[PDB]
Amino acid sequence: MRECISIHVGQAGVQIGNACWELYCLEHGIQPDGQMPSDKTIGGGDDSFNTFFSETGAGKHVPRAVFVDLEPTVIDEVRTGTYRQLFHPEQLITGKEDAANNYARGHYTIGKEIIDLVLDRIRKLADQCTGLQGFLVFHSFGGGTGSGFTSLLMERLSVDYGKKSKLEFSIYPAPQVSTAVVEPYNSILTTHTTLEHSDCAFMVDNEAIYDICRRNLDIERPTYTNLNRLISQIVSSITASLRFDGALNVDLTEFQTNLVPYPRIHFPLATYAPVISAEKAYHEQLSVAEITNACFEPANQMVKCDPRHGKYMACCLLYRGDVVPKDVNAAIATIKTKRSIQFVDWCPTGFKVGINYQPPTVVPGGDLAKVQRAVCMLSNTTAIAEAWARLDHKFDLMYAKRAFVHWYVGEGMEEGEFSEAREDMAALEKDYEEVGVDSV
Amino acid sequence: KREHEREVIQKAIEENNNFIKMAKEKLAQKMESNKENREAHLAAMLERLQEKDKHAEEVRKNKELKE
Amino acid sequence: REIVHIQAGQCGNQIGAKFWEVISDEHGIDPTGSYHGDSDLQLERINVYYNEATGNKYVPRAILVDLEPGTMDSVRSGPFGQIFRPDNFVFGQSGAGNNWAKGHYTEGAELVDSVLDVVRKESESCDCLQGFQLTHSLGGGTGSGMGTLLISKIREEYPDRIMNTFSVMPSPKVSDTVVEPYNATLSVHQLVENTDETYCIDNEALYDICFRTLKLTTPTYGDLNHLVSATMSGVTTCLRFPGQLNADLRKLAVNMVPFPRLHFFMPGFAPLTSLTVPELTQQMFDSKNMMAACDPRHGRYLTVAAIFRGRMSMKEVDEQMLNVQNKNSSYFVEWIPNNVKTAVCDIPPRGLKMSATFIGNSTAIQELFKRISEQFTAMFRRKAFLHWYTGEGMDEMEFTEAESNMNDLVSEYQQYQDATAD
Ligand SMILES: Nc1nc2c(ncn2[C@@H]2O[C@H](COP(=O)(O)OP(=O)(O)OP(=O)(O)O)[C@@H](O)[C@H]2O)c(=O)[nH]1
Ligand SMILES: Nc1nc2c(ncn2[C@@H]2O[C@H](COP(=O)(O)OP(=O)(O)O)[C@@H](O)[C@H]2O)c(=O)[nH]1
Numbered sequence: 011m012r013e014c015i016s017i018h019v020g021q022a023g024v025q026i027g028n029a030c031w032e033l034y035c036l037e038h039g040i041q042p043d044g045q046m047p048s049d050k051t052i053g054g055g056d057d058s059f060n061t062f063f064s065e066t067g068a069g070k071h072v073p074r075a076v077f078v079d080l081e082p083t084v085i086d087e088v089r090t091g092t093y094r095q096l097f098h099p100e101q102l103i104t105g106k107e108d109a110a111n112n113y114a115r116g117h118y119t120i121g122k123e124i125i126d127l128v129l130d131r132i133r134k135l136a137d138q139c140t141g142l143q144g145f146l147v148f149h150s151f152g153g154g155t156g157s158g159f160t161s162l163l164m165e166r167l168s169v170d171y172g173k174k175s176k177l178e179f180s181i182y183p184a185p186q187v188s189t190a191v192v193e194p195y196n197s198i199l200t201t202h203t204t205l206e207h208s209d210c211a212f213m214v215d216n217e218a219i220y221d222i223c224r225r226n227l228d229i230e231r232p233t234y235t236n237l238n239r240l241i242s243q244i245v246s247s248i249t250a251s252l253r254f255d256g257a258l259n260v261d262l263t264e265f266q267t268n269l270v271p272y273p274r275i276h277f278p279l280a281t282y283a284p285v286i287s288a289e290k291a292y293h294e295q296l297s298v299a300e301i302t303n304a305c306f307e308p309a310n311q312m313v314k315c316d317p318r319h320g321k322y323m324a325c326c327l328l329y330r331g332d333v334v335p336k337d338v339n340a341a342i343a344t345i346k347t348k349r350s351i352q353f354v355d356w357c358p359t360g361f362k363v364g365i366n367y368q369p370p371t372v373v374p375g376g377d378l379a380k381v382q383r384a385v386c387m388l389s390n391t392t393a394i395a396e397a398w399a400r401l402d403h404k405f406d407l408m409y410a411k412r413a414f415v416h417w418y419v420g421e422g423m424e425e426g427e428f429s430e431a432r433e434d435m436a437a438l439e440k441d442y443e444e445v446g447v448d449s450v
Numbered sequence: 451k452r453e454h455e456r457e458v459i460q461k462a463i464e465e466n467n468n469f470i471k472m473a474k475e476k477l478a479q480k481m482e483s484n485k486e487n488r489e490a491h492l493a494a495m496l497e498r499l500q501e502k503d504k505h506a507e508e509v510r511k512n513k514e515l516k517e
Numbered sequence: 518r519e520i521v522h523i524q525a526g527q528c529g530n531q532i533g534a535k536f537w538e539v540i541s542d543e544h545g546i547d548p549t550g551s552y553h554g555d556s557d558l559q560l561e562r563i564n565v566y567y568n569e570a571t572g573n574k575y576v577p578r579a580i581l582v583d584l585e586p587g588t589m590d591s592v593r594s595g596p597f598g599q600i601f602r603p604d605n606f607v608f609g610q611s612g613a614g615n616n617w618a619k620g621h622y623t624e625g626a627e628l629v630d631s632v633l634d635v636v637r638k639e640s641e642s643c644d645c646l647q648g649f650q651l652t653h654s655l656g657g658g659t660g661s662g663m664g665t666l667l668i669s670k671i672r673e674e675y676p677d678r679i680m681n682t683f684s685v686m687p688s689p690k691v692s693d694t695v696v697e698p699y700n701a702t703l704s705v706h707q708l709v710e711n712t713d714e715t716y717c718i719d720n721e722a723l724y725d726i727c728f729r730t731l732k733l734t735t736p737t738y739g740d741l742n743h744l745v746s747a748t749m750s751g752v753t754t755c756l757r758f759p760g761q762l763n764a765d766l767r768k769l770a771v772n773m774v775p776f777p778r779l780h781f782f783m784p785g786f787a788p789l790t791s792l793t794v795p796e797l798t799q800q801m802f803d804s805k806n807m808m809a810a811c812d813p814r815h816g817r818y819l820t821v822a823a824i825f826r827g828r829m830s831m832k833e834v835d836e837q838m839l840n841v842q843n844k845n846s847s848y849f850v851e852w853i854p855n856n857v858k859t860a861v862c863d864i865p866p867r868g869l870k871m872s873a874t875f876i877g878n879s880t881a882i883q884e885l886f887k888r889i890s891e892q893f894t895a896m897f898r899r900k901a902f903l904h905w906y907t908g909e910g911m912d913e914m915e916f917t918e919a920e921s922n923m924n925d926l927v928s929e930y931q932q933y934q935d936a937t938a939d
């Protein structure tokens with residue numbers, strides 16, 4: 011009961027998937043062959059970790075996950091790497107030819123050829139669930155598969171699973187590690203087509219993660235591996251309430267009630283602390299107050315924007331590790347007596363808190379210090395729309411001259427789809443302005 | 451009150467079904483239109499290429515009516 | 518995945534031969550087709566350009582074409598000459614005589630179907646064909662006229678694959694053959710419609726580099742060709758080795774070609790053999806390092822791909838790539854954000870600790886086309902040598918049409934050069 015199915019789409023989706031599932035395994039005591047000695051009920055159970063792992067009679071704990079990509083070389087690494095026994099082969103699905111950084115090929119030309127198979131395999135996961143809660147979909151905005159195949163899949167999932175919850179982890183593009191000039195097109199197309207099919211979406215700005223790696227972990231030139239390890243800690247923090255139990259534990263769905271005041275306003279800002287090197291963490295114990303303080307430092311946000319220049323509609327603090335409410339409450343009181351935390355006039359200002367007692371883990375050979383306590387803040391702030399503004403502007407620059415548009419038109423798309431997607435984005439930025447204006 | 455309770459849940463059903471139905475139909479429209487557009491793009495390419503052929507035969511034929 | 522290589526005519530087969538010798542060495546393949554390298558990175562994407570035969574042998578997926586049998590005897594006797602598949606040699610007996618019409622409409626057309634049979638055999642065995650690359654000159658007769666015929670013929674049968682060319686532009690500094698501007702313009706006319714991406718390998722630039730920079734009093738085709746193979750290796754590195762950026766022909770095109778007709782790239786290389794990352798970077802953007810004789814400060818960049826090779830600091834590469842963009846901002850169009858992409862590959866070319874290859878889509882490429890056009894018109898307005906072409910069946914109209922299309926291409930590169938964001 012309460013199963014969650016993860017779907018990792020395209021390179022970014024898949025590689026972030028690798029990092030998350032490795033991390034989950036370590037958090038839960040699951041070996042790379044899928045065995046979990048601590049689990050005494052063989053071949054099934056209703057433990058909290060079962061929301062993310064099914065079990066075979068032979069004692070294997072198998073991620074409720076599908077990996078999909080239109081070319082094979084990234085998933086081939088999963089097939090042949092360290093956690094290859096973790097996954098049944100049918101959970102890892104590949105085409106022969108990718109979307110070539112083109113939303114149209116991901117959604118139509120190439121995507122249409124593998125979509126029924128993907129849904130077949132997701133259906134196989136669903137049928138093993140006694141109370142499926144919904145899906146978590148991981149993907150880039152910028153890639154052809156991450157953008158166009160994800161959109162197609164989300165549209166088909168609404169049809170096939172009705173209103174079952176769909177949450178995204180969406181990788182927003184940064185010039186430091188982007189690989190296509192047309193990513194702004196792909197980002198707007200997929201955001202427009204997915205918007206009505208997603209209940210909640212956590213954007214991860216590659217530039218924010220890149221900066222955090224450079225600045226807080228002293229990594230000269232971060233690789234995807236560096237980025238993904240940090241992303242996985244954040245993803246882990248958000249899903250921990252689903253995977254562990256606890257008296258002070260608060261379900262992600264409960265935070266969602268507070269995070270989403272209107273269906274379209276469904277993009278929380280995540281902020282994570284502490285991100286600190288082993289070198290800096292040694293003999294330096296960061297207190298509940300210190301990590302909570304860090305949540306209101308914009309440098310620690312997963313999306314670049316300035317909440318101090320916007321308005322809050324919700325603030326949620328998801329703690330893990332050695333943390334009790336007394337200390338949280340005191341930390342919050344201080345922060346209120348000293349910060350630019352302004353709420354819209356129609357929302358209560360109380361911070362919503364959950365605590366999972368299981369301490370954070372790190373992957374061997376990684377950059378993050380192992381710490382006793384960590385926190386992820388999820389806020390609903392009007393400032394997140396800055397990310398849409400930056401992207402919409404880049405789209406406008408190119409689209410005005412119709413730069414690269416022939417690549418999409420050649421794959422069957424119409425200019426009408428571009429203008430329609432861009433207008434939806436204009437309306438979304440307007441939605442974020444409106445919700446911040448005072449009541450009359 | 452019971453009548454109203456019955457109407458609320460039937461309303462919730464109707465709207466969810468209508469959402470499914472409309473998602474389903476919008477997708478079929480987009481995929482149909484995309485298929486036709488692409489095919490028409492490829493057809494125009496081939497026709498242009500086949501006029502090139504047409505034109506090269508016409509050229510060899512003119513060389514012959516010159517010799 | 519798989520690329521199919523076609524080389525047509527003398528130039529095409531010559532620079533084609535060097536290309537295979539050079540990348541074979543890079544991938545640790547010897548003249549017999551056996552691998553004898555030291556790194557698994559050499560073999561990972563080997564199937565992009567090589568077929569694997571029995572005996573752990575690697576056979577370039579390469580097709581060798583000419584209306585003149587001589588060239589493919591010299592090929593067959595070159596160092597890696599025994600590496601090519603015997604059945605993949607398709608030669609006529611006639612010659613083209615630098616007559617584009619012969620290559621395109623008559624002689625070449627007589628031989629084209631046998632070439633297709635070979636392309637089909639190679640394409641059918643591909644797991645997932647990416648597309649094609651063709652090497653040829655535009656000034657001769659076979660490479661230019663038959664080469665462009667092949668393109669259109671292949672496109673009819675593989676309309677959804679990428680067509681890429683390495684096209685050698687003629688220069689009076691290298692060849693006195695008077696009609697070359699006719700052959701080049703007629704070619705460009707074809708390329709503008711039927712290729713997805715063309716590398717402009719300009720003999721004018723090659724000579725000038727060899728003469729001025731390398732201080733070679735008398736450049737041979739050998740000398741020119743050393744530049745060509747170095748460039749060709751560089752601009753194909755992202756296709757042949759594991760990596761993120763432009764790793765296939767379609768992703769390259771999607772990054773580099775914002776308007777379908779504007780697909781003529783200016784390649785560049787550093788160092789040009791009197792070295793730091795800043796120094797590498799500055800030179801790869803210098804006109805003196807361009808393989809097309811055009812000054813990029815006479816226009817603007819639509820898009821750029823930079824490829825660094827060797828052991829070096831990626832941090833420094835990133836900072837220097839940011840530096841050149843900032844300091845030269847005027848020369849990149851503002852209405853294509855982030856239009857410069859950079860790749861770094863660990864494996865340096867033979868004989869270098871590090872190198873940089875440059876691929877620019879610059880509106881300054883019009884200087885190349887204007888130069889051909891000037892030489893075309895000097896002749897066409899005196900109907901000089903036309904009977905060669907009318908004699909094979911062509912008419913003057915096609916000449917006029919080719920000239921107008923090329924003139925249009927120039928106007929289009931100028932249009933985007935003048936465009937602004939506001
Ligand atoms: N954080 C992070 N970003 C990634 C990773 N891999 C790719 N990206 C980003 O994702 C975008 C590119 O999309 P991809 O996921 O690689 O492409 P794709 O979904 O496989 O689509 P196609 O290759 O076009 O079929 C760029 O913005 C990259 O910087 C990754 O492992 N981690
Ligand atoms: N860079 C270079 N150019 C060449 C080479 N061989 C011929 N060319 C050029 O190609 C043009 C003549 O075409 P060519 O290839 O010889 O005739 P074809 O055999 O009919 O294709 C002239 O402009 C020559 O300078 C070569 O090895 N290298």
Ligand SMILES: [Ca+2]
Nearest residue numbers: 049051054055
């Ligand atoms: Ca169990």
Ligand SMILES: [Mg+2]
Nearest residue numbers: 020021108155
């Ligand atoms: Mg991909």
Ligand SMILES: [Mg+2]
Nearest residue numbers: 614615657658
């Ligand atoms: Mg010749």
Ligand SMILES: [Mg+2]
Nearest residue numbers: 527615657692
């Ligand atoms: Mg010659």
